[PDB]
């Protein structure tokens, strides 16, 4: 009845011993990490306008981050995925735009075809929100601090003056044909090569930018927007993550 | 501490110790007599 198999004595008679835990494991990394105790929500940077404090009279530039159809699609767990995170989805998209596979995924998770999806990593299993629920601006409290991730404005192929604040050469006094140049780019022969990471002209902007400890000036569920003190990376209609500030409480 | 190659005990109250692969001379009376071998 049983299948034929041979087993080595060396592997059978080996005394059982558990492996020691390693730093470059997922679970150790998770333990190390500095993470927020609560989920976040995806937003769109609609624009920017003044916020007048009515008690003091102080004016503060505030960016208006709109919150539309923001929904916990699913979430990830340490036993399956190696970490705790809430996959949030923002907005509504047409059928036409979304891939068949993505549409099926959304149907399985029981949400509308979504405009932008993103994870929000958390410390514990307690931080996970039940899936399918709708996240509104009232999630955040007025006066609380939040970290803000988004892709910055694209600046194109920039020079070393704009990239790195290089002083450049003089305007007059003989200076020929190199007024905005980086000057020397190395050393005669010992290096015999431009060493890695030498600040040179290149593409700038259109990279992710976390902005830490920004104050939530105002929250209102009526207009579907979170007011946030100061600037946020990227153009108008750019997607903006918002989670509680790890540094500030 | 007088960090030096030569490490002799000065007074009777000085005592030599061997720690961390270095000869130390501590002293119970005079604190100036503290020495270390390199």
């Amino acid at each position: 009845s049983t299948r034929p198999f041979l087993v080595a004595p060396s592997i059978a008679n080996s005394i059982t011993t558990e492996a020691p835990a390693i730093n470059h494991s997922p679970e150790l990394a998770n333990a190390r990490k500095w993470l927020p105790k609560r989920c976040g929500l995806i937003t769109r940077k609609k624009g920017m306008m003044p916020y007048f404090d009515k008690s003091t009279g102080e004016r503060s530039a505030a960016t208006i981050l709109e919150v539309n159809n923001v929904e916990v699609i699913m979430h990830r767990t340490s036993e399956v995925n190696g970490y705790f995170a809430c996959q949030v989805g923002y907005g509504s998209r047409h059928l036409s735009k979304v891939s068949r596979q993505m549409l099926g995924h959304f149907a399985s998770k029981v949400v509308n075809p979504k405009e932008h999806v993103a994870e929000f990593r958390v410390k514990d299993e307690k931080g996970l929100i039940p899936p399918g629920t709708l996240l509104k601006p009232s999630f955040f409290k007025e006066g609380q601090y939040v970290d803000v991730r988004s892709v910055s404005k694209g600046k194109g192929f920039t020079g070393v003056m704009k990239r790195y604040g290089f002083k450049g050469l003089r305007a007059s006094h003989g200076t020929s044909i190199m007024h905005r140049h980086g000057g020397s780019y190395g050393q005669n022969q010992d290096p015999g090569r431009v060493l890695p990471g030498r600040k040179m002209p290149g593409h700038m902007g259109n990279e992710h930018v976390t902005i830490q400890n920004v104050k939530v000036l105002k929250v209102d569920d009526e207009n579907n927007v979170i007011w946030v003190k100061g600037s946020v990376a990227g153009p108008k209609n750019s997607f903006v993550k918002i989670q509680d500030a790890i540094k500030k409480t | 501490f007088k960090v030096r190659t030569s490490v002799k005990k000065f007074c009777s109250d000085c005592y030599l110790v061997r720690r961390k692969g270095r000869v130390y001379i501590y002293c119970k009376s005079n604190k100036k007599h503290k020495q270390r071998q390199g």
Partner: protein
Amino acid sequence: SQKIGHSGLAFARLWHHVDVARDKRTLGRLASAIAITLIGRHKPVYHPSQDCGDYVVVTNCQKIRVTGKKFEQKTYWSHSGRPGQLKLQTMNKVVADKGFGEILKKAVSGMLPKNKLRKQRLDRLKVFDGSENPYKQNITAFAHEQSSIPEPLKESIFNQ
């Protein structure tokens, strides 16, 4: 005349277990022993032009012997190319990062011949800090050895 026949068994890649808990060799000597196996020098059919070396599964690698104070002194180096980026890690630190198996692998790599087959040979080495491993089922075995092993242990191994 000697060469003529069925050569398939000669060039067969066997799988060699080594329970490091049982083995009494130090790290480097063990690595050197492994290297030969990985190359295929042990087998008489060997030729330098042909890779014909066996698999080596190392297990219970946490109990590997290291003499002197090498565990807290011996430094493993690394360098990208950009100056001021020399990464020097002590043996214990390397172990904490990855394991004792990583350490063994490095030794074995250094033992091996420096050419296009080296990487392949290194890949064939399968090291494990503790006991449990997927290759348990594929180590070379014989029917005459089966009486030594108790009845239910074999079944448990097969299940695993």
